């Protein structure tokens, strides 16, 4: 039978950006059926899209880097992608290597670099990389090739070699899929859903290190399940008996029910909520499996 | 009964530095009984030291940051620590906030900053922070206060606010515990051990982004268990029947035995190995639980 790890959301890892889960909410004003490629798993353990097992892979990539200076542009990095375990990347039935970002904007990345200049010979260098949208850099992570650059007056005299790019910050964030294949189609995990009428997506929220104007809000990013749930299903061999699992989210201390929800076996959680604005929940509760229920099970409204 | 997650080591997360596990080995030329404070858990789910459940907490800290400019030093950050979920840090029966680094050297950290000096207003700033040894910054994370700085010609005009500092690189890495309390005593998870005669520690190895000489080796750091094994023991409620578990690490496709080892219930793994130099293992096997065994159970030599 199915069980869940006993971990409060606030102690879990986010599945789309490498940070703590800070928020748990529903928001009908947001896109209902997001096409997220990370944080996607079936209760039976099948990983979907670019979803890695390890939280350290999320919004990262590995590559053979080749660097050049180009008067007017600066230092340019051409990254020939590999999977983050060092194995060969082959275009297949997903958008990109495991853990490649599944959102848009300009990502500041950090990579181990080696220079021949005087001073620090091995150091970490920040580059700027457009994820999307298209009409920018003609990125083709699906094909195994992406481009980054940084302002420089002169060549940084960087030696070509293997890197693992990790995210520093996001500029112009937008939660739509990035340019996977120079504006062409790629194989994608399908949109999250479907929902019965009245059902809305439960969102696990973190906030992204950002470049913005003084009076910007924290930059929110949502996922369907925390990374500990993703690896839990992938590392277990659970038998699926019907369309959804009834869960109860309870106050750890008082035993009080906060809400009931359906974990659909395709790896997303629905609540019955008819408000039009966001509703936040305490992040210190525990999810418990009650039972398998049919597709048409009617949740108590929250 | 106690089981293990079905995850190849190369697909797991390191428990002391936020990166993939890349290596699996024994090396009796290395300190036999390390006093690591992260990656420490009992089979019964009892966390030791500063060990967090979430991999994203590892080698990170959160704080109320206060910034000042001090000519001849540069920009100085005083970090008043909180736990990474935003809950108050309270000095207790462990060295530091959960996930706080458990090694020495100078860490480049990144934090969200806000500036009034005109350009970008919200951005990410790198600081340098000495973890250890002593005779440096007089760090006291036990008491909730640590210090970092960066070279600046003039004030960066940074606004005081909440940060989560994440690791960019390590300079002068050394695998000994940092300065936790300005030279004073702190509660530590005990040295790893004991081992039978001929038994040695199994190491899960990753490599750290570094500042070093042009010809330096990759900077290795080892842990007792990958983070997925840590969260697995903490998020389960196992009943301990004996001093150790016999594990067999097997080829995932053929079931060929690569080695047998003992998971002592205090959260470390021993192999019986009589060589003097390092021995590496494939990272694409699976650990299987065979049985509870006593302390004195004699393993097949590798």
């Amino acid at each position: 039978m199915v069980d869940l790890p006993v971990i409060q959301p606030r102690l879990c890892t986010h599945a789309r950006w490498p940070a703590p889960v800070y928020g748990l909410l529903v928001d009908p004003s947001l896109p209902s059926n997001p096409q997220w490629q990370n944080g996607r798993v079936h209760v039976d353990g099948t990983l979907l899209g670019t979803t890695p097992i390890s939280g350290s892979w999320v919004s990262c990539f590995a590559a053979e880097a080749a660097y050049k200076f180009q008067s007017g542009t600066g230092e340019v990095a051409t990254f020939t992608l590999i999977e983050q375990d060092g194995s060969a990347y082959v275009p297949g039935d997903r958008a990109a290597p495991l853990g490649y970002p599944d959102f848009s904007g300009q990502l500041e990345i950090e990579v181990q670099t080696e220079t021949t200049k005087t001073g620090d010979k091995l150091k970490v260098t920040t580059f700027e990389m457009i994820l999307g949208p298209t009409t920018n850099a003609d990125q083709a992570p699906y094909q195994g090739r992406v481009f980054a650059s940084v302002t420089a007056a002169a060549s940084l005299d960087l030696v070509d070699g293997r890197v693992r790019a990790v995210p520093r910050s996001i500029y112009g964030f937008q939660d739509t899929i990035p340019e996977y294949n120079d504006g062409l189609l790629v194989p994608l995990a399908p949109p999250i859903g479907p929902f019965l009428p009245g059902e809305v997506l439960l969102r696990f929220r973190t906030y992204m290190r950002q470049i913005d104007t003084a009076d910007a809000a924290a930059e929110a990013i949502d996922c369907a399940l925390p990374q500990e749930f993703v690896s839990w299903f992938a590392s277990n061999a659970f038998t699926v008996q019907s369309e959804a699992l009834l869960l109860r989210y309870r106050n750890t201390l008082t035993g009080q029910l906060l809400f009931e929800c359906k974990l659909y076996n395709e790896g997303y959680i629905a609540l019955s909520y008819s408000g039009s604005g966001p509703l936040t929940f305490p992040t210190d509760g525990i999810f418990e499996v009650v039972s398998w229920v049919p597709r048409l099970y009617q949740l108590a409204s929250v | 009964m106690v089981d293990l997650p079905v995850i190849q080591p190369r697909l797991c997360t390191h428990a002391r530095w936020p990166a993939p596990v890349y290596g699996l080995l024994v090396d009796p030329s290395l300190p036999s009984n390390p006093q690591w404070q992260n990656g420490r858990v009992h089979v019964d789910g009892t966390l030791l030291g500063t060990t967090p459940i979430s991999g994203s907490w590892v080698s990170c800290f959160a704080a109320e940051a206060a910034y000042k400019f001090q000519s001849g030093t540069g920009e100085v950050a005083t970090f008043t620590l909180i736990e990474q979920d935003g809950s108050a840090y309270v000095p207790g029966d462990r060295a530091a906030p959960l996930g706080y680094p458990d090694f020495s050297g100078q860490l480049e950290i990144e934090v969200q900053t806000e500036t009034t000096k005109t350009g970008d207003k919200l951005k990410v700033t790198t600081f340098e922070m000495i973890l250890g040894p002593t005779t440096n910054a007089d760090q006291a994370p036990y008491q909730g206060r640590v210090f970092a700085s960066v070279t600046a010609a003039a004030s960066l005009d940074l606004v005081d606010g909440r940060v989560r500092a994440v690791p960019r690189s390590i300079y002068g890495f050394q695998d000994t515990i940092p300065e936790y309390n300005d030279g004073l005593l702190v509660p530590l998870a005990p040295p790893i051990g004991p081992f039978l005669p001929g038994e040695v520690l199994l190491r899960f190895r990753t490599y750290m982004r570094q500042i070093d000489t042009a010809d330096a080796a990759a900077e290795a750091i080892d842990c007792a268990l990958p983070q997925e094994f840590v969260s697995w023991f903490a998020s389960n409620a196992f009943t301990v029947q004996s001093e150790a578990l016999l594990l067999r690490y097997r080829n995932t496709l053929t079931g060929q035995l690569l080695f047998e080892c003992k998971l002592y219930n205090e959260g470390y793994i021993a192999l019986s190995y009589s060589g003097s130099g390092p021995l590496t293992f494939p990272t694409d096997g699976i650990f299987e639980v065979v049985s509870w065994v006593p302390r004195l159970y004699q393993l097949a030599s590798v």
Partner: nanobody, 122 residues
Framework: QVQLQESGGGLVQAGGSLRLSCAKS????????MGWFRQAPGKEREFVAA????????NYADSVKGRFTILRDKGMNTAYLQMNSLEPEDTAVYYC???????????????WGQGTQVTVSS
């Protein structure tokens, strides 16, 4: 290579409206601002407006504030100048430009349009 193509230039009566558009094509390797400059016969090239890549930050010349608006969608390759309450002194060749930046600069633009003539007749 990087190109800018602008249009929407014409003749209009004082107090009229005109809308300029610009599109960037070719590969850029990081975020880029898009701006409008103008140059009347004889006189020197002046800044009109600029918008950052995120489309959240705008800078305007004092002479066009409350009359001209610059428009762009986050991360996208087109910019627009909605020129309202036009006056004969606004007569000029209007040039689209782009430059590598996370903000909306006023100077040091690397990439230039061919320009489009605006003529306001009193």
């Amino acid at each position: 290579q990087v190109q800018l193509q602008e249009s929407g230039g014409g003749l209009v009566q004082a107090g009229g409206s005109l809308r300029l558009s610009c599109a960037k094509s070719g590969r850029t390797f990081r975020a880029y601002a898009m701006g409008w400059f103008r140059q009347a016969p004889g006189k020197e090239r002046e800044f009109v407006a600029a918008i950052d890549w995120s489309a959240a930050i705008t800078n305007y010349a004092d002479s066009v504030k409350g009359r001209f608006t610059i428009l762009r969608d986050k991360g996208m390759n087109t910019a627009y100048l909605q020129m309202n309450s036009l006056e004969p002194e606004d007569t000029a060749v209007y040039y689209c430009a782009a430059t590598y930046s996370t903000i909306a600069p006023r100077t040091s633009y690397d990439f230039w349009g061919q320009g489009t003539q605006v003529t306001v007749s009193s």
